[PDB]
Amino acid sequence: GAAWGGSYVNDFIDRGRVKKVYVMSEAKYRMLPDDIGDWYVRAADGQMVP
Amino acid sequence: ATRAFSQIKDAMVFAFNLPAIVELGTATGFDFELIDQAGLGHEKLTQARN
């Protein structure tokens, strides 16, 4: 999700009025299905997994 | 009473009566609001009030 869908995390305060915080991928690593391969999941032990 | 507690106190203490039309003003009198438009912050607005 937070790579491809985005994530509202917490709120921060811009110039004195509250705005949002979204964490998401950069553009170029979430356009074509092959980009699925770029993402690895950290395991129980300490290894990345495609 | 305002005479009693004006001079002989270390902090200000009023003694008074409510008007007949409560929640709705005196006769000679106004309620001004100084408002922040550019995002100038608490200090600049405060100082502006002074």
Curated annotation (Swiss-Prot), chain A:
Disulfide bonds: none annotated. Disruption phenotype: Loss of susceptibility to contact-dependent growth inhibition (CDI); inhibiting cells still contact the target. Induction: Positively regulated by MarA, Rob and SoxS transcriptional regulators (at protein level). It is found in: Cell inner membrane. Belongs to the resistance-nodulation-cell division (RND) (TC 2.A.6) family. AcrA-AcrB-AcrZ-TolC is a drug efflux protein complex with broad substrate specificity that uses the proton motive force to export substrates. (Microbial infection) Involved in contact-dependent growth inhibition (CDI), acts downstream of BamA, the receptor for CDI. Its role in CDI is independent of the AcrA-AcrB-TolC efflux pump complex. Homotrimer, with large domains that extend into the periplasm, interacts with AcrA and TolC. AcrA may be required to stably link this protein and TolC. Interacts with AcrZ. Part of the AcrA-AcrB-AcrZ-TolC efflux pump. This is Multidrug efflux pump subunit AcrB. The lineage of its organism: Bacteria, Pseudomonadati, Pseudomonadota, Gammaproteobacteria, Enterobacterales. The chain holds residues 751 to 800 of 1049 of the full protein.
Swiss-Prot record, chain B:
It comes from the Bacteria. Disruption phenotype: Loss of susceptibility to contact-dependent growth inhibition (CDI); inhibiting cells still contact the target. Induction: Positively regulated by MarA, Rob and SoxS transcriptional regulators (at protein level). It is found in: Cell inner membrane. AcrA-AcrB-AcrZ-TolC is a drug efflux protein complex with broad substrate specificity that uses the proton motive force to export substrates. (Microbial infection) Involved in contact-dependent growth inhibition (CDI), acts downstream of BamA, the receptor for CDI. Its role in CDI is independent of the AcrA-AcrB-TolC efflux pump complex. Homotrimer, with large domains that extend into the periplasm, interacts with AcrA and TolC. AcrA may be required to stably link this protein and TolC. Interacts with AcrZ. Part of the AcrA-AcrB-AcrZ-TolC efflux pump. Belongs to the resistance-nodulation-cell division (RND) (TC 2.A.6) family. This is Multidrug efflux pump subunit AcrB. The gene is acrB. The chain holds residues 651 to 700 of 1049 of the full protein.
